[PDB]
């Protein structure tokens, strides 16, 4: 009775284990800091109790005496995937398994 949907069952196994892999391998969010900055590797641990993040840029001084500021940047980046299309695909697989088995 299920002999002919075993292909679809394998496909559902794969389409689920690869999302478990995506969930397990990548990092959900990170603070991203950019720029020529001194970051104390110990102060970064206080990141959870911090309220103000202050980034002071490097001031480069030219041989001709001109002063100019490096770029500094800060923000959170987060892991994301195509939920709409993977859910539509796994919904279709599940629906087809139930349809063909009645």
């Amino acid at each position: 009775d299920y002999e002919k949907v075993i292909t679809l069952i394998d496909l559902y196994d794969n389409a689920e284990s690869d999302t478990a892999n995506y969930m397990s391998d990548l990092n959900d969010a990170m603070l991203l800091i950019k720029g020529n900055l001194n970051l104390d590797p110990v102060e970064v641990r206080k990141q959870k109790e911090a309220n103000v993040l202050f980034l002071e840029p490097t001031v480069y001084v030219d041989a001709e005496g001109r002063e100019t500021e490096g770029s500094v940047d800060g923000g959170y980046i987060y892991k994301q995937y195509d939920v709409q299309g993977t859910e539509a695909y796994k919904d279709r697989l599940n629906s087809d398994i139930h349809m063909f088995t009645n």
């Binding site: 720029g35 102060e43 911090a50 103000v52 993040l53 001031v59 001084v61 005496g65 490096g70």
Partner: peptide
């Protein structure tokens, strides 16, 4: 030379990231 002594010359100062 006298002016260079009185003014000196600034040098590249590296930035800081602080979480307070």
């Amino acid at each position: 030379i006298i002016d260079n002594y009185f003014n000196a010359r600034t040098r590249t100062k590296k930035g800081r990231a602080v979480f307070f």
